[PDB]
Amino acid sequence: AGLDNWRGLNVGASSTVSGAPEMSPASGVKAIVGDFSRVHWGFQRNFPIELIE
């Protein structure tokens, strides 16, 4: 089971770090490390699931 903590850091694992199914040739990147407080992100508007008929 993928460890959640490593040497006092927060570790998250997902298939987005390389984007294996979404990308085509794959970036080849296996890990991204750093101060993730330096990256500001957010949903300015997040809708629920919509059914159009």
């Binding site: 089971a1 993928g2 694992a13 298939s15």
Partner: protein, 52 residues
């Protein structure tokens, strides 16, 4: 071979393995090695084996 076998299924990070079917002739082939005192998991079977 067992570690490489579970590594074959769990290698892609997909499909978490659980449950292992062994043979009696292969249960004895596994070493009865146990973790030392220094490391955690001390006094615990390192492999399925057959002696435990």
């Amino acid at each position: 071979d067992l570690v490489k076998a579970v590594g074959l299924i769990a290698g892609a990070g997909l499909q978490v393995p659980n449950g292992v079917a062994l043979d009696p002739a292969f249960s004895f082939a596994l070493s009865t090695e146990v973790y030392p005192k220094g490391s955690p998991l001390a006094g615990q079977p390192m492999y399925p084996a057959a002696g435990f």
